[PDB]
């Protein structure tokens, strides 16, 4: 069985790995190749701070709630493993700030020690009147991506750096299954009007005294669109930009001032952190994740395409669940081809 | 009036500050001076991780508990100040690990969001069956000591590097008040059998992914003597060593291993942290802080000695309370001399 994964973000690589470690002992020639226009440093996944946190309001598909849950329980089970540091995996507590009282998140019992802000804490943030506090996990995209490769490489998963033009192209050269993990750019290979870029821009700053994450929430601004501060391993992420439809992969000097002024108002100590660099990325926005099979009707017969894109602003949070699912689906294919 | 302060550690400097700001206006010639044998870079106060947290069991003088309280609200109130970083001040949440269930601390409501660890959290630390979790503060002793220094230097307080041989020596040469902040070395000036060196050794290590302090408790070894992990700004502090009576200011190879071994067990990810520094220190251990006046009867008249030492292993946690008290005690000295 020749298997071609398109894309090398958290999704492609996490799906690649899963499919391997779950089916390599069962399929005799399980040949898995990764095709991607961009690698390790130049993906959206690298632009992610990697804070685990699904939306506030429930998802359109309750499957997703489990997927995130699955992912959290996985990473948490490994927070102490001797490899945690290569993964870029660590614990982080922090604040979720709100203007008015809002219902508990469905994930409340997933994070460690969930609870509500005690007045003295809100005192630290004059402009916010209510909020949560809990312990969570960070999985730095860059590190994680780097770690996934090593696992993948020693597993014989070959990487090629190319821009796939069509699903047929990849089919024409032997692919029995095509795992489709092409992120926001998925549209180029098959129309999907429901997919939109959630353009983001961030600032990496040096402020090692910040030990907590601090996410603001504002209805006049909308999801991911108010100041947030996520302490990384080597550097603190200053962010708060989400613009639908914007394809401009370029740091914007107007957005810069937004990030800076917003985060500085939040935490004035950040008023003397040294700016280390700025980045722009595209959230794979979709009413829900396309995580399903499709019989792609090739030449004489047809070839199986598993879709795995549209994880919007919470890829790292959900990725592992999705991978395990993309693997189950893979396994179904194997059954139907009676090559199980 | 002529004030001499002996001690350039947290107590000396912080006391001098309180005295000055409270009494520069009311005294015609308020002339404060600091004599110290060691300064800002080479004090015990410089080995202190700086974690705010008093003992678990209530102290002697219940007035102490009030002092830690004053200190904690003072610091919390400046956590977002423009100069919080020069102070070396920041917020930090973390764990406290106990073997069996055990009654809550007296301070439970001074810290932020105090609560008990939920079973899952306790599953992170297999060796511990019960504990607390709260947000707290660090005042890195070094950064703080440097900040005070500038404050004092700005306020015209003069510094002299000298070994004071006796109270009288300093009285003979002109002092009207002698604020005694000689910490653990207080004995060499006035017999105090209760004062004792609580020797400790720390390990500064480079593990920026750690966002929480982890303190352990084990009665078989008592306070300060079980693995602890305190994330500073530049580096993580490893520790767990308390030795009463030991006056060796010298890093110990057996102590090292003990620290390193103890801490790697607590949190395995430390196993791959690079070791940056190693340092010994003496907690000024006493049944209780001595914070009181004393008329030292010299020649014609006598001079006034405010004693302020014996803060053991919680000097930073408590410094501001004590400092305010010594300034109050200094106040009366004033009224009685008809200088109010
Ligand atoms: C600023 C910002 C902050 C974020 N913070 C977080 C956070 O804290 N937590 C969190 O969970 N998520 C966060 N996210 C979002 C999350 O990181 C993404 O949803 C996640 O990375 C999704 O994985 P992916 O689908 O992006 O893989 P991608 O990064 O989209 O993978 C794309 C790869 O596939 C290749 N490709 C695409 N089309 C083709 C083609 N036709 N031929 C060949 N190759 C192709 C590309 O070249 C690229 O190499 C953040 C996002 C942004 C922008
Ligand atoms: C390893 C370790 C970790 C610690 N961690 C913490 C923590 O996390 N939180 C916390 O709150 N506390 C902690 N402590 C304790 C705390 O650091 C001390 O209790 C605190 O610094 C007390 O202030 P001080 O008396 O030490 O001032 P000192 O450090 O004692 O100042 C001494 C100065 O006085 C001078 N001096 C002394 N005698 C004379 C003399 N006769 N003539 C002239 N000069 C003299 C000395 O040369 C020196 O300059 C820790 C202690 C240790 C050892």
UniProtKB/Swiss-Prot annotation, chains A, B:
Residues 216-228 are annotated as: Active site lid that may open upon substrate/product migration in and out of the active site and close to increase the hydrophobicity of the active site, to make the hydride transfer reaction more efficient. Its EC number is 1.4.3.3. Phosphorylated in the cerebellum; probably not by PRKACA, PRKCA or PRKCE. May be S-nitrosylated, which partially inactivates the enzyme. Inhibited by benzoate, crotonate, thiolactomycin, chlorpromazine (CPZ), risperidone, haloperidol, sulpiride, aripiprazole, blonanserin, quetiapine, 4H-furo[3,2-b]pyrrole-5-carboxylic acid, and the substrate analog CF3-D-ala (3,3,3-trifluoro-D-alanine). Inhibited by luvadaxistat, and 6-chloro-1,2-benzisoxazol-3(2H)-one (CBIO). Induction: Induced in cells following exposure to etoposide. Changing residue 38 to H: Found in a patient with ALS; impairs FAD binding; 20-fold decreased affinity for D-serine; 300-fold decreased affinity for D-alanine; 3-fold decreased affinity for D-proline. D-serine binds at residues 224, 228, 283, 313. Expressed in the cerebellum, in astrocytes of the cortex, in motor neurons and fibers of the lumbar spinal cord (at protein level). Expressed in goblet cells of the small intestine (at protein level). Increased in the cerebellum of schizophrenic patients (at protein level). Decreased in motor neurons of the spinal cord of patients with amyotrophic lateral sclerosis (at protein level). Expressed in the cerebellum, spinal cord, kidney, and thalamus. Abundant in glia of the cerebellum and predominantly neuronal in the dorsolateral prefrontal cortex, hippocampus and substantia nigra. Keywords: Amyotrophic lateral sclerosis, Cell projection, Cytoplasm, Disease variant, FAD, Flavoprotein, Neurodegeneration, Oxidoreductase, Peroxisome, Phosphoprotein, S-nitrosylation, Schizophrenia, Secreted, Synapse. It catalyses: a D-alpha-amino acid + O2 + H2O = a 2-oxocarboxylate + H2O2 + NH4(+); D-alanine + O2 + H2O = pyruvate + H2O2 + NH4(+); D-cysteine + O2 + H2O = 2-oxo-3-sulfanylpropanoate + H2O2 + NH4(+); D-dopa + O2 + H2O = 3-(3,4-dihydroxyphenyl)pyruvate + H2O2 + NH4(+). Residues 1-16 are annotated as: Required for protein stability. Changing residue 331 to V: Leads to the formation of ubiquitinated protein aggregates; impairs targeting to peroxisomes; results in abnormal peroxisomal morphology; decreases cell viability. One of its GO terms (biological process) is D-serine catabolic process. D-proline binds at residues 228, 283, 313. FAD binds at residues 8-11, 37-38, 43-45, 49-51, 163-164, 182, 283, 312-313, 315-317. It is found in: Peroxisome matrix; Cytoplasm, Cytosol; Presynaptic active zone; Secreted. D-dopa binds at residues 53, 283, 313. PANTHER family: D-AMINO ACID OXIDASE, D-AMINO-ACID OXIDASE. Catalyzes the oxidative deamination of D-amino acids with broad substrate specificity. Required to catabolize D-amino acids synthesized endogenously, of gastrointestinal bacterial origin or obtained from the diet, and to use these as nutrients. Regulates the level of D-amino acid neurotransmitters in the brain, such as D-serine, a co-agonist of N-methyl D-aspartate (NMDA) receptors, and may modulate synaptic transmission. Catalyzes the first step of the racemization of D-DOPA to L-DOPA, for possible use in an alternative dopamine biosynthesis pathway. It is linked to Schizophrenia: A complex, multifactorial psychotic disorder or group of disorders characterized by disturbances in the form and content of thought (e.g. delusions, hallucinations), in mood (e.g. inappropriate affect), in sense of self and relationship to the external world (e.g. loss of ego boundaries, withdrawal), and in behavior (e.g bizarre or apparently purposeless behavior). Although it affects emotions, it is distinguished from mood disorders in which such disturbances are primary. Amyotrophic lateral sclerosis: A neurodegenerative disorder affecting upper motor neurons in the brain and lower motor neurons in the brain stem and spinal cord, resulting in fatal paralysis. Sensory abnormalities are absent. The pathologic hallmarks of the disease include pallor of the corticospinal tract due to loss of motor neurons, presence of ubiquitin-positive inclusions within surviving motor neurons, and deposition of pathologic aggregates. The etiology of amyotrophic lateral sclerosis is likely to be multifactorial, involving both genetic and environmental factors. This is D-amino-acid oxidase.
């Amino acid at each position: 069985m020749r298997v071609v994964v398109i894309g090398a973000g958290v999704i492609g690589l996490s799906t690649a790995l899963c499919i391997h470690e779950r089916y390599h002992s069962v399929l005799q020639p399980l040949d898995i190749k990764v095709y991607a226009d961009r690698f390790t440093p130049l993906t959206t996944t690298d632009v992610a701070a990697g804070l685990w946190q699904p939306y506030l309001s429930d998802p359109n598909n309750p499957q997703e709630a489990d997927w995130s849950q699955q992912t959290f329980d996985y990473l948490l089970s490994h927070v102490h493993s001797p490899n945690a540091e290569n993964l870029g995996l660590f614990l982080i507590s922090g604040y979720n700030l709100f203007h008015e009282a809002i219902p508990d998140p469905s994930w409340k019992d997933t994070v460690l020690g969930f609870r509500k802000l005690t007045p003295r804490e809100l005192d630290m943030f004059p402009d916010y009147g209510y909020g949560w506090f809990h312990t969570s996990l960070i999985l730095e995209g860059k590190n994680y991506l780097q770690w996934l490769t090593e696992r993948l490489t020693e597993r014989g998963v070959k990487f090629f750096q190319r821009k796939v033009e069509s699903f047929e192209e990849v089919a024409r050269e032997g692919a029995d299954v095509i795992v489709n993990c092409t992120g926001v750019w998925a549209g180029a290979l098959q129309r999907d009007p429901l997919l939109q870029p959630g353009r983001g821009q961030i600032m990496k700053v040096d402020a090692p005294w910040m030990k907590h994450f601090i996410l603001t929430h504002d209805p006049e601004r909308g999801i991911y669109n108010s100041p947030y501060i996520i302490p990384g391993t080597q550097t603190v992420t200053l962010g708060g930009i989400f613009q639908l439809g914007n394809w401009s992969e370029l740091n914007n000097i107007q957005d810069h001032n937004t990030i800076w002024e917003g985060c500085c108002r939040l935490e004035p100590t950040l008023k003397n952190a040294r700016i280390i660099g700025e980045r722009t990325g595209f959230r794979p926005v979709r009413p829900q994740i396309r995580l399903e099979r499709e019989q792609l009707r090739t030449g004489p017969s047809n070839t199986e395409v598993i879709h795995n894109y549209g994880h919007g602003g919470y890829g790292l949070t959900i990725h592992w669940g999705c991978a395990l699912e993309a693997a189950k689906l893979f396994g179904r294919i194997l059954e139907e081809k009676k090559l199980s």
